[PDB]
Amino acid sequence: MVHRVWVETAHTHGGEYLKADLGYGEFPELEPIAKDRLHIFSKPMQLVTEKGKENMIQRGTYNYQYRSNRPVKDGSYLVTAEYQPTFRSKNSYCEQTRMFGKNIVNVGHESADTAIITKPVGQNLEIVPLDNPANIHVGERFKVRVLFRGEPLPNATVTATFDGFDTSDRSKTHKTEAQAFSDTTDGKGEVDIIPLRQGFWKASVEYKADFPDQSLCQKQANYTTLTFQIGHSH
Amino acid sequence: MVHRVWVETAHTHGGEYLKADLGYGEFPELEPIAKDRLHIFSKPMQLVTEKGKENMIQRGTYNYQYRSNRPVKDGSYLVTAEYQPTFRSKNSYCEQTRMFGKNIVNVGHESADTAIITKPVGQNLEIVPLDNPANIHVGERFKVRVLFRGEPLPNATVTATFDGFDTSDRSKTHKTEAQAFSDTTDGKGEVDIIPLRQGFWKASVEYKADFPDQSLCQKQANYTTLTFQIGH
Numbered sequence: 441m442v443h444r445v446w447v448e449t450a451h452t453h454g455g456e457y458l459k460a461d462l463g464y465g466e467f468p469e470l471e472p473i474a475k476d477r478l479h480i481f482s483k484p485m486q487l488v489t490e491k492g493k494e495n496m497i498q499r500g501t502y503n504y505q506y507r508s509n510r511p512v513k514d515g516s517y518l519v520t521a522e523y524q525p526t527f528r529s530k531n532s533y534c535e536q537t538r539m540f541g542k543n544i545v546n547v548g549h550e551s552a553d554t555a556i557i558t559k560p561v562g563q564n565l566e567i568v569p570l571d572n573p574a575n576i577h578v579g580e581r582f583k584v585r586v587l588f589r590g591e592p593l594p595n596a597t598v599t600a601t602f603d604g605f606d607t608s609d610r611s612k613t614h615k616t617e618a619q620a621f622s623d624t625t626d627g628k629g630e631v632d633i634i635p636l637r638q639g640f641w642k643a644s645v646e647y648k649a650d651f652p653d654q655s656l657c658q659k660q661a662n663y664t665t666l667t668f669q670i671g672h673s674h
Numbered sequence: 675m676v677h678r679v680w681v682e683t684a685h686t687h688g689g690e691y692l693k694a695d696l697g698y699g700e701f702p703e704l705e706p707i708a709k710d711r712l713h714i715f716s717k718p719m720q721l722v723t724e725k726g727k728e729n730m731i732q733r734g735t736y737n738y739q740y741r742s743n744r745p746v747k748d749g750s751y752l753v754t755a756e757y758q759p760t761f762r763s764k765n766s767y768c769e770q771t772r773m774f775g776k777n778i779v780n781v782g783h784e785s786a787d788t789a790i791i792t793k794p795v796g797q798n799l800e801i802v803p804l805d806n807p808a809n810i811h812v813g814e815r816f817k818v819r820v821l822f823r824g825e826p827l828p829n830a831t832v833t834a835t836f837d838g839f840d841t842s843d844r845s846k847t848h849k850t851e852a853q854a855f856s857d858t859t860d861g862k863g864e865v866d867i868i869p870l871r872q873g874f875w876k877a878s879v880e881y882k883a884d885f886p887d888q889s890l891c892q893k894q895a896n897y898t899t900l901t902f903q904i905g906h
């Protein structure tokens with residue numbers, strides 16, 4: 441069907457390596473990226489810490505698994521993935537597709553720092569959180585912002601779902617695309633997600649616009665997600 | 675201020691009068707219809723029974739409060755309201771706006787009739803339920819069909835929210851309320867809503883297309899809603 445990009449990190453305590461997974465497909469099913477689509481993920485996923493952006497390495501039984509170079513202390517970090525810009529033809533016209541994913545990882549049951557996670561990373565279409573997902577109970581408001589080319593993106597629809605919401609009769613041709621939240625961004629680009637359950641959540645946004653250089657391509661489509669945790673697994 | 679149209683019903687046991695309300699504004703705050711938009715609601719709300727559609731009586735303190743002419747027996751009915759077609763200029767082109775609202779009313783406890791609540795009443799854009807909400811608990815799929823001009827509508831975004839989900843912004847931004855559900859219809863216009871908390875629920879779908887007679891108006895917009903209850 442349709443393929444979107446997201447990131448998922450396993451529960452990590454202090455002193456360990458950070459195991460992360462790049463999902464290209466239908467959330468939340470992790471699946472290996474096909475050989476004809478290996479070139480669209482040219483660069484490895486990055487990990488954001490107090491020192492900056494670090495390249496992760498690809499190690500595991502499947503090609504979507506990554507681990508950090510060195511173990512990290514307790515804290516709260518981001519892990520980002522990118523679908524490299526590619527060109528396609530539709531009907532006819534050219535269109536450049538790009539996709540982005542960012543996951544908030546809280547290593548340690550006590551850390552909920554906001555210094556690293558709230559700073560934008562430079563994704564063309566980016567969802568920047570303004571709080572820590574661990575500070576939000578069910579029913580509270582999780583305030584985030586939507587940026588496009590650096591500036592805020594007003595009047596942009598942000599939806600959100602979680603693992604376990606849409607599950608009935610799913611297969612290759614059924615969606616499990618039902619969302620547990622939907623709203624629009626204000627003039628400052630901000631919006632508040634309201635989670636009614638606990639688990640692993642993904643908030644999605646998209647933006648189709650005109651390509652800057654019309655002598656090369658005409659349209660542009662960006663699909664961005666942000667993944668986090670509501671509640672506590674351990 | 676968006677000003678969307680929906681409907682609301684009170685706790686009614688079989689035998690007494692059916693008192694309903696027409697909301698024209700931001701859900702769920704009821705507010706009287708201003709004098710400059712009375713003409714858009716020239717036709718009163720209708721109530722459907724086994725006897726068919728019957729008009730209601732706009733009697734009460736405010737001009738949005740309606741009462742049933744005939745006391746109703748126990749069962750399951752629908753109450754409908756219409757924002758009549760108006761023309762506006764946008765940019766420069768013409769757009770015809772029509773809006774609709776429908777409420778499932780279960781009068782009397784243990785009322786789960788589906789004889790008439792699942793029948794299309796004939797709204798240009800319509801949200802026809804395929805189940806009684808009283809039989810739907812928390813976390814259970816509620817299958818609804820979306821009709822446009824009689825035939826189903828595929829790939830239409832249906833959202834749903836409930837009273838108490840969003841508690842902010844009385845008139846600061848006047849933007850749309852936060853939704854607690856969002857999905858799209860399949861090839862037969864069907865979609866399953868998943869209510870995660872008990873309360874007074876309202877679902878919405880909108881459709882913007884061309885106008886049939888291009889020598890009169892160019893565009894057309896329809897905003898249709900469906901209100902019901904999930905426990906208490």
Ligand SMILES: [Co+2]
Pocket residue numbers: 451453549673674
């Ligand atoms: Co633990």
Ligand SMILES: [Co+2]
Pocket residue numbers: 685687
């Ligand atoms: Co009672």
